[PDB]
PDB file of C-alpha atoms and ligand atoms in Angstrom:
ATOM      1  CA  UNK U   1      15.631  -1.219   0.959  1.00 28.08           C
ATOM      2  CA  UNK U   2      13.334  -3.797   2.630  1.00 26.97           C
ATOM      3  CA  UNK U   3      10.381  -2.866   0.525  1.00 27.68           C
ATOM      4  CA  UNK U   4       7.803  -5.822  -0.629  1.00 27.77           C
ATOM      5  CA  UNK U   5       9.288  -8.412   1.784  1.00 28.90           C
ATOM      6  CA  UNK U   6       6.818  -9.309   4.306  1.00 28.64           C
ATOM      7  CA  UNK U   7       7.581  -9.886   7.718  1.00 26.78           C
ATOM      8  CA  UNK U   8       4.986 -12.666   8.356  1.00 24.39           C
ATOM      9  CA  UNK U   9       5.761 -14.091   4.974  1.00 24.36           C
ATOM     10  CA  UNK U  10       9.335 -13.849   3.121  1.00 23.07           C
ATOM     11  CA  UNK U  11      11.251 -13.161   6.091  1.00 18.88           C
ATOM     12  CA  UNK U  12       9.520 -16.327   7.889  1.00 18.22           C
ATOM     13  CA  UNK U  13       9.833 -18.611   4.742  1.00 20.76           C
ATOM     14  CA  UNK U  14       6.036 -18.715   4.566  1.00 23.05           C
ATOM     15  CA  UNK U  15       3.832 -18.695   1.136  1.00 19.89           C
ATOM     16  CA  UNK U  16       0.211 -16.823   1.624  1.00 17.25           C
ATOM     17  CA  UNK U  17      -2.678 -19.124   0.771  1.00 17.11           C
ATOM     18  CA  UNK U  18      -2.733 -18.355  -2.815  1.00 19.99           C
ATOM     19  CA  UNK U  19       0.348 -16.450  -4.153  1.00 18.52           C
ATOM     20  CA  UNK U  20       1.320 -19.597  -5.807  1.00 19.77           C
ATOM     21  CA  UNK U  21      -1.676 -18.337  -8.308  1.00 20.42           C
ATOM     22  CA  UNK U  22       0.460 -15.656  -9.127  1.00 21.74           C
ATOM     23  CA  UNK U  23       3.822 -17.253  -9.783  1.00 21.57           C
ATOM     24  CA  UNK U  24       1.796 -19.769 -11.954  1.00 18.26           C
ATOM     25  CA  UNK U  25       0.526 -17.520 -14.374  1.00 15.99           C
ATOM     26  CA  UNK U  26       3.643 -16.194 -15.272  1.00 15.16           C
ATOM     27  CA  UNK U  27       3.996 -19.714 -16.986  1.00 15.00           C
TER      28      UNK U  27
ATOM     29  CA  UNK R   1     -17.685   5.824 -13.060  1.00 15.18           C
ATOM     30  CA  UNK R   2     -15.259   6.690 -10.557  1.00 16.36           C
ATOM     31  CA  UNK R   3     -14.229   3.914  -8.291  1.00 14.28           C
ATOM     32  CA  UNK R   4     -16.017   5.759  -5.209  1.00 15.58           C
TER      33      UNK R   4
ATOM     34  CA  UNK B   1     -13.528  -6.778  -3.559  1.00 13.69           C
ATOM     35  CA  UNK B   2     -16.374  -8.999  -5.099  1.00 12.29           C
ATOM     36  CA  UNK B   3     -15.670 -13.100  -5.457  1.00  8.41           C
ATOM     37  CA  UNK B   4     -12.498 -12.963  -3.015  1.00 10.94           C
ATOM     38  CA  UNK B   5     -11.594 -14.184   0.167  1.00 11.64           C
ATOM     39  CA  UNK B   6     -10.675 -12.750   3.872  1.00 11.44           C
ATOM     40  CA  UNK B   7      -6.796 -11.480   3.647  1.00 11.70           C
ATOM     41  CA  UNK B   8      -4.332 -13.737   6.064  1.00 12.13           C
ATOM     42  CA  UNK B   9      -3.167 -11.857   8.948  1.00 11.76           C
ATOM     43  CA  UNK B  10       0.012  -9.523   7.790  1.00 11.73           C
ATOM     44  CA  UNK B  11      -0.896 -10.512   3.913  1.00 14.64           C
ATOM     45  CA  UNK B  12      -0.763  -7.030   2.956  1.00 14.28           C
ATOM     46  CA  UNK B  13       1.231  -4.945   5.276  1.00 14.84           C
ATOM     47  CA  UNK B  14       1.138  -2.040   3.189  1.00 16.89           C
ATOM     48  CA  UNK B  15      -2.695  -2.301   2.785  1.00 14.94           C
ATOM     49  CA  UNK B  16      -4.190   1.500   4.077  1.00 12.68           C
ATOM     50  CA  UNK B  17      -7.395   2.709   4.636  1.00 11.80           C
ATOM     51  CA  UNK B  18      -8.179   6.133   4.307  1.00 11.52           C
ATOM     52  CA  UNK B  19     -10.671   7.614   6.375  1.00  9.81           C
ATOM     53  CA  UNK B  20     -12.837  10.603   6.698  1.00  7.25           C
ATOM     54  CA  UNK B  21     -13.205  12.463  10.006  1.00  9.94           C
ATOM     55  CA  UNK B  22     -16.345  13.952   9.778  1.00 11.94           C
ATOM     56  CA  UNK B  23     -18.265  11.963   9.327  1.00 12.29           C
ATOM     57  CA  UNK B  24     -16.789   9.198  10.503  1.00 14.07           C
ATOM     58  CA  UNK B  25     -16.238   6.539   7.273  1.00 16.97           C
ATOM     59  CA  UNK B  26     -14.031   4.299   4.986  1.00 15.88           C
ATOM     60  CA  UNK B  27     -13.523   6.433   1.852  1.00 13.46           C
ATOM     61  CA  UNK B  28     -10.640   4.583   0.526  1.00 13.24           C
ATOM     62  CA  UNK B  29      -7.498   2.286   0.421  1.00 14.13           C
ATOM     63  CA  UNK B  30      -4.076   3.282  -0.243  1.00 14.51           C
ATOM     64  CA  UNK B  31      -0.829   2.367   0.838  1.00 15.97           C
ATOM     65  CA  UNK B  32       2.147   2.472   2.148  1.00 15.90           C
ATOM     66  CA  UNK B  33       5.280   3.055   0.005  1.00 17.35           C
ATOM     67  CA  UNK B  34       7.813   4.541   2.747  1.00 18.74           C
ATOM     68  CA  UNK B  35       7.682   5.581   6.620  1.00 19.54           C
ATOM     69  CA  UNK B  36       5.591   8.527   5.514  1.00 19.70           C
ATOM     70  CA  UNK B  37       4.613   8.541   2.166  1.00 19.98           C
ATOM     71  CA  UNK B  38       1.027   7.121   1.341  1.00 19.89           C
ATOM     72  CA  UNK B  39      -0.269   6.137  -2.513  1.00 20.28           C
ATOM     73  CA  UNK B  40      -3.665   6.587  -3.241  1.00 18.41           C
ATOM     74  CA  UNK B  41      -5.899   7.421  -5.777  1.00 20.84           C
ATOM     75  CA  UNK B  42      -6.458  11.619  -7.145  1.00 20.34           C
ATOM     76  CA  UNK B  43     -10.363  10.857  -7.229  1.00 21.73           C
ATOM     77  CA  UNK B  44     -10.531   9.669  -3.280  1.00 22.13           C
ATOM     78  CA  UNK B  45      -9.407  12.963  -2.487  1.00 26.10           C
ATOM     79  CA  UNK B  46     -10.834  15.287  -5.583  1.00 24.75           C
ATOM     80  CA  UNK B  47     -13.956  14.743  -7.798  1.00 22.99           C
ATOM     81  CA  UNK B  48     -15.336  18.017  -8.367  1.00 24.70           C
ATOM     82  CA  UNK B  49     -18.048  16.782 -10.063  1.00 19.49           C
ATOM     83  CA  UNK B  50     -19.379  15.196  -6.805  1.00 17.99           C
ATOM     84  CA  UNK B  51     -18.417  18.326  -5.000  1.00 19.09           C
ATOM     85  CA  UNK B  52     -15.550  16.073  -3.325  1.00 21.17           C
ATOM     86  CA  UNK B  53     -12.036  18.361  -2.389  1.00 20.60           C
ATOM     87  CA  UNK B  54     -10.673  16.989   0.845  1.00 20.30           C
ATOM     88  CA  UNK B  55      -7.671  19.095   2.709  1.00 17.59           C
ATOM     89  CA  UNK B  56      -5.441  17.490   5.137  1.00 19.20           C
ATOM     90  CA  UNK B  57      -7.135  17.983   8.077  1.00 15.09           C
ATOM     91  CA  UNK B  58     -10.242  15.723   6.736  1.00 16.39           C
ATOM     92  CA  UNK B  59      -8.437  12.989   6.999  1.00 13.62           C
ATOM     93  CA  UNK B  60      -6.874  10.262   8.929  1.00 17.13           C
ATOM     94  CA  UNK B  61      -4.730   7.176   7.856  1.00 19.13           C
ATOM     95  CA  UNK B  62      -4.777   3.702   9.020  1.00 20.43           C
ATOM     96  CA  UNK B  63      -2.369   1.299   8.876  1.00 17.07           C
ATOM     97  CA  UNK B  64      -1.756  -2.294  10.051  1.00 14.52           C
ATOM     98  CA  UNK B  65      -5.631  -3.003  10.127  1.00 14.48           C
ATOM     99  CA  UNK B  66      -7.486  -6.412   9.302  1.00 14.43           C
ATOM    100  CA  UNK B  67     -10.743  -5.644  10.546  1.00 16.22           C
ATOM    101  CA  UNK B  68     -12.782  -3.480   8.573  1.00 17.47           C
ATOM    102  CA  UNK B  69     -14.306  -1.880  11.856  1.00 18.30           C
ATOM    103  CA  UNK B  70     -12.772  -2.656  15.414  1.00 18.42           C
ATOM    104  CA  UNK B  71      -9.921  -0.542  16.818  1.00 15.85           C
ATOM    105  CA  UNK B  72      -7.048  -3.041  16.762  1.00 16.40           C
ATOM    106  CA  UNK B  73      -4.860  -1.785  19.754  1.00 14.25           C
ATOM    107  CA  UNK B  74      -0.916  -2.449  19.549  1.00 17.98           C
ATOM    108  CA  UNK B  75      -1.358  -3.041  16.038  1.00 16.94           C
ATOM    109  CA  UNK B  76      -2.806  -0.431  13.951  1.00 16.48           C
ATOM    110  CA  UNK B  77      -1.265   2.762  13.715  1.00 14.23           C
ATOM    111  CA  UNK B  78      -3.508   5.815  13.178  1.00 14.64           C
ATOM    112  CA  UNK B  79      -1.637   8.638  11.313  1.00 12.83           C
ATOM    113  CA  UNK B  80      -2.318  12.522  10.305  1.00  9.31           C
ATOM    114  CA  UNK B  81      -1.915  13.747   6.732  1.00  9.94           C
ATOM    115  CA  UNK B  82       1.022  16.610   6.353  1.00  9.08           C
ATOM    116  CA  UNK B  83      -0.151  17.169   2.445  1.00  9.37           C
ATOM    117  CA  UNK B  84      -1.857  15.973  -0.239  1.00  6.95           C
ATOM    118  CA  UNK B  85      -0.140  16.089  -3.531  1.00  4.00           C
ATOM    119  CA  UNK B  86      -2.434  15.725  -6.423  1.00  6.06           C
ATOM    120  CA  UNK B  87      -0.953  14.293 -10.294  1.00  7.96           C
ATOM    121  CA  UNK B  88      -0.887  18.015 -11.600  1.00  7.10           C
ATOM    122  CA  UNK B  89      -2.465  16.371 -14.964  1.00  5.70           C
ATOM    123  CA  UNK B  90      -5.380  13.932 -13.507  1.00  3.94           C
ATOM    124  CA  UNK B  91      -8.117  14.654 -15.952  1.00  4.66           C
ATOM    125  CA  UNK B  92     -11.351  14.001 -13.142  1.00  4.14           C
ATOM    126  CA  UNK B  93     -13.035  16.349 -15.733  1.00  3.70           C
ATOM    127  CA  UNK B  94     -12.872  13.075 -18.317  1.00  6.44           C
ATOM    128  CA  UNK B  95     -11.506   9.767 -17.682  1.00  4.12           C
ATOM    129  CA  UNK B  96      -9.519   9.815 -14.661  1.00  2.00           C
ATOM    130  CA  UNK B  97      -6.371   9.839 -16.574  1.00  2.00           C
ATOM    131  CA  UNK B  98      -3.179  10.197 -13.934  1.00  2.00           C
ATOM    132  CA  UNK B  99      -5.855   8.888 -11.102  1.00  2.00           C
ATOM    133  CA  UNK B 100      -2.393   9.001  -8.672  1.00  2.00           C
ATOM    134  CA  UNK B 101      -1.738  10.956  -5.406  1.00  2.00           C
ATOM    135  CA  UNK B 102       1.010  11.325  -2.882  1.00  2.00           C
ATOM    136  CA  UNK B 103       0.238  12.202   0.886  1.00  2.00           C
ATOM    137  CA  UNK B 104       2.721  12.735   3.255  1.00  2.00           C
ATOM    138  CA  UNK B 105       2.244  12.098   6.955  1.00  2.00           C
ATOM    139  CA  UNK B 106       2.897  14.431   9.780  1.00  2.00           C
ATOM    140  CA  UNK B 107       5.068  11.859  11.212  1.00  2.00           C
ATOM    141  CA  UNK B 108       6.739   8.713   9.772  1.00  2.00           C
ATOM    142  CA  UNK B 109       4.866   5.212  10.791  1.00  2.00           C
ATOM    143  CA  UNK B 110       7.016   2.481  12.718  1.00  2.00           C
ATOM    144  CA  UNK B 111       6.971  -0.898  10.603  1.00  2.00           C
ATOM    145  CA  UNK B 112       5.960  -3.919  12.533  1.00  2.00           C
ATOM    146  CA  UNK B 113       5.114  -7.705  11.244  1.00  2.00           C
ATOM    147  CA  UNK B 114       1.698  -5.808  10.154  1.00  2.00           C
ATOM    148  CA  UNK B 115       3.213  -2.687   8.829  1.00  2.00           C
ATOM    149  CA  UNK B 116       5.371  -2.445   5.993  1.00  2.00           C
ATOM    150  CA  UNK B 117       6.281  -0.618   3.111  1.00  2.00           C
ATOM    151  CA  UNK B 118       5.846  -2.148  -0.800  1.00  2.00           C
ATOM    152  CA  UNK B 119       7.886  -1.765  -3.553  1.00  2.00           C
ATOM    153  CA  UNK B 120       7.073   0.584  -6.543  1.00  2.00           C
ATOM    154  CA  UNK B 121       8.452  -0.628  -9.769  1.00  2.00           C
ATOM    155  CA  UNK B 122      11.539   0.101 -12.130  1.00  2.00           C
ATOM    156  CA  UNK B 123      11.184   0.157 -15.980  1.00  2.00           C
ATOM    157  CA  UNK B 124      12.757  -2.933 -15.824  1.00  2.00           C
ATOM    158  CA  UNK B 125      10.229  -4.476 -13.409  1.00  2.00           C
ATOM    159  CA  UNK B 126       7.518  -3.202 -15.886  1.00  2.00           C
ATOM    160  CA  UNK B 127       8.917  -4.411 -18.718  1.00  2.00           C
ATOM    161  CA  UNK B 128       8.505  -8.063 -17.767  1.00  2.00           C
ATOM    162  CA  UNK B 129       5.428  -8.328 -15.137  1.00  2.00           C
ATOM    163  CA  UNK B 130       3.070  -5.875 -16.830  1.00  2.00           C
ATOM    164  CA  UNK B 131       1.432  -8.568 -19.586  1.00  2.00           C
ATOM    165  CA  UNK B 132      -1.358  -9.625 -20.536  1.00  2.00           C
ATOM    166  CA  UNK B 133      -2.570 -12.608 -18.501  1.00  2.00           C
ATOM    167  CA  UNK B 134      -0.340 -12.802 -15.654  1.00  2.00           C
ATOM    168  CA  UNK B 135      -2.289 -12.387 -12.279  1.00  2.00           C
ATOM    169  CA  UNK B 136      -1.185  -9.521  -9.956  1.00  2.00           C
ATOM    170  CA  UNK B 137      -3.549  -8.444  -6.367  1.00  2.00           C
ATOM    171  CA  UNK B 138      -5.951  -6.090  -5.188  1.00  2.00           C
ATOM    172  CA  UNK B 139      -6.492  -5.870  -1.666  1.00  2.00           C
ATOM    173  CA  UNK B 140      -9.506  -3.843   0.254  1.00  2.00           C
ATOM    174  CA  UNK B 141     -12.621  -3.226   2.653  1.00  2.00           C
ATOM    175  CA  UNK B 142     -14.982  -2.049  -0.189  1.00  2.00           C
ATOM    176  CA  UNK B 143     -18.444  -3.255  -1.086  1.00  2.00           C
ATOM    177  CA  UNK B 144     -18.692  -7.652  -1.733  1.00  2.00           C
ATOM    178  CA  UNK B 145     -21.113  -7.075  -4.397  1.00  2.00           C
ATOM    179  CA  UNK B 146     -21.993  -4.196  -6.825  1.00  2.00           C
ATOM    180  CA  UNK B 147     -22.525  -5.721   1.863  1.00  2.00           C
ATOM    181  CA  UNK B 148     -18.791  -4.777   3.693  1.00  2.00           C
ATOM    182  CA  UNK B 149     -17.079  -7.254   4.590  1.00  2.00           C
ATOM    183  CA  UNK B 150     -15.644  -8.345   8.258  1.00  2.00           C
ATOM    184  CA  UNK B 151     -12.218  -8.336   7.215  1.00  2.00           C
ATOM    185  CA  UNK B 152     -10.080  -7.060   4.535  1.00  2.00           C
ATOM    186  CA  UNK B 153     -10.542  -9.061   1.526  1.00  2.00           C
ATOM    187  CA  UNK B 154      -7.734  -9.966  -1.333  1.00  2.00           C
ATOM    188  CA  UNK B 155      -8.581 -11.641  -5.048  1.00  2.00           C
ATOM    189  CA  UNK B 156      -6.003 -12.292  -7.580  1.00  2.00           C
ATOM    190  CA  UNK B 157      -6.857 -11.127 -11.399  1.00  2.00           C
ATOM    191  CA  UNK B 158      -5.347 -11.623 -14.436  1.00  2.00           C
ATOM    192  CA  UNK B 159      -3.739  -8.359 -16.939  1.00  2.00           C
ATOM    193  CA  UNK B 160      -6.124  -7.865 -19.749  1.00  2.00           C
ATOM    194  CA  UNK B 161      -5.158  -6.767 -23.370  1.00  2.00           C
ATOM    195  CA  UNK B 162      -5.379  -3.162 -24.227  1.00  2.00           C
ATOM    196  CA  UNK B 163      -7.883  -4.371 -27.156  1.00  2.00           C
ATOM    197  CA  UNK B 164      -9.908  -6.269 -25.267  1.00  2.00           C
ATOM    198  CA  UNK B 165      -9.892  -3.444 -22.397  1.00  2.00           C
ATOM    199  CA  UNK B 166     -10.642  -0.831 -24.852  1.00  2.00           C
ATOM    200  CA  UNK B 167     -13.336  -2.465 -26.727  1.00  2.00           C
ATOM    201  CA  UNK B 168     -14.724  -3.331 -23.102  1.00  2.00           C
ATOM    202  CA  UNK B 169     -16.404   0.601 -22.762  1.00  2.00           C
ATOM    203  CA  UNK B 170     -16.582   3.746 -24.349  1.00  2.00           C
ATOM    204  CA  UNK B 171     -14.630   5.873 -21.956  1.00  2.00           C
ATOM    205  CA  UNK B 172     -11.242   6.496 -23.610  1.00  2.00           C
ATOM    206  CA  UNK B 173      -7.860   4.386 -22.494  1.00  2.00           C
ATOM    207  CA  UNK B 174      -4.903   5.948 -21.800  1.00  2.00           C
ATOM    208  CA  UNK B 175      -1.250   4.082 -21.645  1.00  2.00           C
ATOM    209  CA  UNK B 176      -1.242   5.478 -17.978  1.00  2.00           C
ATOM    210  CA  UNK B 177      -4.239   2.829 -17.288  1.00  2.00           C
ATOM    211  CA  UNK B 178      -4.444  -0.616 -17.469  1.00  2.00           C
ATOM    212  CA  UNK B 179      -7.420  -3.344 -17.232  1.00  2.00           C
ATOM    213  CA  UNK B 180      -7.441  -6.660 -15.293  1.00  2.00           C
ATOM    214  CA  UNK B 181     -10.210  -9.049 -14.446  1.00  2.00           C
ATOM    215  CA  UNK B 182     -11.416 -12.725 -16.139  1.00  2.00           C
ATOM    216  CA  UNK B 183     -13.321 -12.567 -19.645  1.00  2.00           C
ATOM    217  CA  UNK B 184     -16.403 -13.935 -19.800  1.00  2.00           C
ATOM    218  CA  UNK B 185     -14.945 -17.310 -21.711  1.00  2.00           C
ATOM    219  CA  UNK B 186     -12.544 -17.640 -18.514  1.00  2.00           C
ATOM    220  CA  UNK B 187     -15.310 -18.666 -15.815  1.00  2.00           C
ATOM    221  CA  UNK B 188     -13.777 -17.539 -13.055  1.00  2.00           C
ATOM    222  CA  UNK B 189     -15.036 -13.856 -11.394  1.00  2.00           C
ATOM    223  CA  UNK B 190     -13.468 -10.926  -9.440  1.00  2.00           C
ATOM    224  CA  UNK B 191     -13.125  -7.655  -9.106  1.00  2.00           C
ATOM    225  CA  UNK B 192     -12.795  -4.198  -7.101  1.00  2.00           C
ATOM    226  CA  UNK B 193     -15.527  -2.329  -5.963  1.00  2.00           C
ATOM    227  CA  UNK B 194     -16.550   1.248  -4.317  1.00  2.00           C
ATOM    228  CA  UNK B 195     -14.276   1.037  -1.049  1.00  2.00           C
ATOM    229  CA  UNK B 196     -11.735  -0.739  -2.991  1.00  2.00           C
ATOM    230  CA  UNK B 197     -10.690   2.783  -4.849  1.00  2.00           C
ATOM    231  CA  UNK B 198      -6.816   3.828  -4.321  1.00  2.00           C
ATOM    232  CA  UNK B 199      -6.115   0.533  -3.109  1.00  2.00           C
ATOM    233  CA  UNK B 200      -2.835  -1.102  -4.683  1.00  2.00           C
ATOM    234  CA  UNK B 201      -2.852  -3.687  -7.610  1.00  2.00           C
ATOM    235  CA  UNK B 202       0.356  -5.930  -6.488  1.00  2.00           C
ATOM    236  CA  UNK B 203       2.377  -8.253  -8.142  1.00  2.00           C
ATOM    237  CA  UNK B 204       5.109 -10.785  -6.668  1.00  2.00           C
ATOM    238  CA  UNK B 205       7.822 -10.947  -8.387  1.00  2.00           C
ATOM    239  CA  UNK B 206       9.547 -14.275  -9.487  1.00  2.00           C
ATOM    240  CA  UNK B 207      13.304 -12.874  -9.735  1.00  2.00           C
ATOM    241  CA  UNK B 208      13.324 -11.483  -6.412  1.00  2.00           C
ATOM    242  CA  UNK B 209       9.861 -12.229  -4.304  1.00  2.00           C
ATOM    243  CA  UNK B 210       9.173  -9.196  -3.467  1.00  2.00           C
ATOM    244  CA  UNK B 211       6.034  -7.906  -3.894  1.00  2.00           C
ATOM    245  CA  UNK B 212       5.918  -4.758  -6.416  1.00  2.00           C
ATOM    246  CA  UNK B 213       2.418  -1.855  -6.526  1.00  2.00           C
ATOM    247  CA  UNK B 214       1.711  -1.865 -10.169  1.00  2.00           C
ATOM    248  CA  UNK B 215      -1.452  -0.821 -10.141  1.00  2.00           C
ATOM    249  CA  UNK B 216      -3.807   2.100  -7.948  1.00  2.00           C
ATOM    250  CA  UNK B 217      -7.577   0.984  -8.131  1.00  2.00           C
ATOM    251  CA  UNK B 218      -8.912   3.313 -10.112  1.00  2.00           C
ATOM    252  CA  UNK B 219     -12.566   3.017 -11.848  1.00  2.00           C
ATOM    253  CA  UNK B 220     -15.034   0.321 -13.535  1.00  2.00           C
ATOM    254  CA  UNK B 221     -18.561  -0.053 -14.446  1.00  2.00           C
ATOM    255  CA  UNK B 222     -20.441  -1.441 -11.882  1.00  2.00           C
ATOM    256  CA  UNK B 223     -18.243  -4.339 -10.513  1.00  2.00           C
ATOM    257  CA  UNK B 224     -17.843  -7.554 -11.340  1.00  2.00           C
ATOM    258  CA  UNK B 225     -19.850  -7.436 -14.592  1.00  2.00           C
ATOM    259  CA  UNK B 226     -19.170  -9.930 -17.763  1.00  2.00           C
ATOM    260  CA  UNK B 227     -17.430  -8.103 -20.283  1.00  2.00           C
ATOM    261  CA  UNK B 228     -16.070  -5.501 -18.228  1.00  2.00           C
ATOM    262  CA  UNK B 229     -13.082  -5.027 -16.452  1.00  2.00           C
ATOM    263  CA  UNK B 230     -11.590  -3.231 -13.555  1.00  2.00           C
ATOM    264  CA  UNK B 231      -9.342   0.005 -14.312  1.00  2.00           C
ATOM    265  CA  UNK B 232      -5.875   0.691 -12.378  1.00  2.00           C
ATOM    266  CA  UNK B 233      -3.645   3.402 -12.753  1.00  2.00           C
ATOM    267  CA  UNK B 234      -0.251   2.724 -14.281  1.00  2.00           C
ATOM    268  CA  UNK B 235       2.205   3.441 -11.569  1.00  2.00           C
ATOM    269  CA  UNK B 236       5.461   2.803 -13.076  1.00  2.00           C
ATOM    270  CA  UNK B 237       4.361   5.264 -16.217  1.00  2.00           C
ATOM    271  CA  UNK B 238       3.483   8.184 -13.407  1.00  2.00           C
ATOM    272  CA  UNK B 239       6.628   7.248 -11.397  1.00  2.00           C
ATOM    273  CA  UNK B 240       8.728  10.320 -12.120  1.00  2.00           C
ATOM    274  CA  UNK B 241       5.969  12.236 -10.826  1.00  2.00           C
ATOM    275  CA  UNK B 242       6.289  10.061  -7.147  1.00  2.00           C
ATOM    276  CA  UNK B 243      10.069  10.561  -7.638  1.00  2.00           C
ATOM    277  CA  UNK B 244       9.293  14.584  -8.046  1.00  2.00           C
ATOM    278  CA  UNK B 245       7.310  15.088  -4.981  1.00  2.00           C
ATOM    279  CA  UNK B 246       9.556  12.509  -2.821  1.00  2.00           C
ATOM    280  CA  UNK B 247      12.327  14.014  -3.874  1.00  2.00           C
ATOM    281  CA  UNK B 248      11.811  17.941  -3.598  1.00  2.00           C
ATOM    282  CA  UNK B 249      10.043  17.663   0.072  1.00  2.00           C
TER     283      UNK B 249
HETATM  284  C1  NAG M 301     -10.152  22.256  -3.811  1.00  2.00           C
HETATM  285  O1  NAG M 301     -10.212  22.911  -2.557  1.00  2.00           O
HETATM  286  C2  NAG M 301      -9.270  23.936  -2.328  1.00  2.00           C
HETATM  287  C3  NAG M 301      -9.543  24.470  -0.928  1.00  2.00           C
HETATM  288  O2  NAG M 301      -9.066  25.791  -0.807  1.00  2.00           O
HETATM  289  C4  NAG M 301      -9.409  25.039  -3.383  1.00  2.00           C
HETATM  290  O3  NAG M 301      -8.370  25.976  -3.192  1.00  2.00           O
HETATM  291  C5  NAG M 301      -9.317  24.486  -4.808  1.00  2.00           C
HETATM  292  O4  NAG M 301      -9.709  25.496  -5.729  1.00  2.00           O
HETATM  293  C6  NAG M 301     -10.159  23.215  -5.020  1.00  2.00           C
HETATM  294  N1  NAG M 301      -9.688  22.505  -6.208  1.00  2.00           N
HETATM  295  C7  NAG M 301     -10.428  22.274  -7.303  1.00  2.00           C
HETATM  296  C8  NAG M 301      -9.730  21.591  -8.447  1.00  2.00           C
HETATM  297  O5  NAG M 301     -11.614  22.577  -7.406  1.00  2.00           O
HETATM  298 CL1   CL M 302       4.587  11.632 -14.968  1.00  2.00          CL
HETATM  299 NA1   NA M 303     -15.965  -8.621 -15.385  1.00  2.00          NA
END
């Protein structure tokens, strides 16, 4: 239900050091 | 070979 | 995980390492898809050619970890396998096809803010993030250079065209594999290596954030080499396998 939402990440409203690399390249 |  | 960097703390909560009792070592990663269930890949646990057939009771899990070596009290959770379930149809005998397996632990795991289950993906999820050149994840404590690293280390590598993966080596591609890493034109370098194997291949998503396992580690030629690319299992083609064994427990 909660799968793939990290707790010291999405549920804080943090961004790891370089997942923006990720969303990027979908572009 | 195999990732080992 | 050669050319990548030490994983922030919690990064990959569903990050695994699989361990052998006797003797004591890292074989493998793995991870976590559910309180109990654990994703890894067939040839961490059977490889006949390398005499490799591990039972239950070989084995530990551990889950929560950051350091590669030191026992991480109040945060790592050290579990016991119930069963291994091996892809009936994993072809170790030629090219790893199916390279998937399911183990079960003798108790489910507690999530924490360092323990947590990912997602597996829906055809729907496949459909749109498994393409060539979008950058997905892989995550592990395996070997910095074709040498173990302090910390669990994470690199980000882009989807590779089945062409371009195919015509990378003469072991035969099957749709239930895929290839990621940088070409040689790109500049940039990366890639799994031995320790790394059954480790997860993760995408986030950009319709929901969450963060989805596409991929299992799975095999490559050397690491890190130009012109050739790391292999992953296809998880959302062997998903009605998962669904099979989850379900009929
Ligand atoms: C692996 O080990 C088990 C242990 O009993 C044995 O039954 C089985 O034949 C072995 N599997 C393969 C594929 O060699
Ligand atoms: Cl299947
Ligand atoms: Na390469």
């Amino acid at each position: 239900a909660d799968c793939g939402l990290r707790p010291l990440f999405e549920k804080k409203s943090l961004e790891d050091k370089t997942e923006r690399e990720l969303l990027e390249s979908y572009i | 070979x195999p990732x080992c | 995980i050669v050319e990548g960097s030490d994983a922030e703390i919690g990064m990959s909560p569903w990050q695994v390492m699989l361990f052998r009792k006797s003797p004591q070592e890292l074989l493998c990663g793995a991870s976590l898809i559910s309180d109990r269930w654990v994703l890894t890949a067939a040839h961490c646990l059977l490889y006949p050619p390398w005499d490799k057939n591990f039972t239950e009771n070989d084995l530990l899990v551990r889950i929560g970890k950051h350091s590669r070596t030191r026992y991480e009290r109040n945060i790592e959770k050290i579990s016991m396998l119930e069963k291994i379930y091996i892809h009936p149809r994993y072809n170790w005998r030629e090219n790893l096809d199916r390279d998937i397996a399911l183990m079960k632990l003798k108790k489910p795991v507690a999530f924490s803010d360092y323990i947590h289950p990912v997602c597996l993906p829906d055809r729907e999820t496949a459909a749109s993030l498994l393409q060539a050149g979008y950058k997905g994840r892989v995550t592990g404590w395996g070997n910095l250079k074709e040498g173990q690293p302090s910390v669990l280390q994470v690199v980000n590598l882009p989807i590779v065209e089945r062409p371009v993966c195919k015509d990378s080596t003469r072991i035969r591609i099957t749709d239930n594999m895929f290839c990621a890493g940088y070409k040689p034109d790109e500049g940039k370098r990366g890639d799994a290596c031995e320790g790394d194997s059954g480790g997860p291949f993760v995408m986030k998503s950009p319709f929901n954030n969450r963060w989805y396992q596409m991929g299992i580690v799975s095999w490559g030629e050397g690491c890190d080499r130009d012109g050739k690319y790391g292999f992953y299992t296809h998880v959302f083609r062997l998903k009605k396998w998962i669904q099979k064994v989850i379900d009929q427990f």
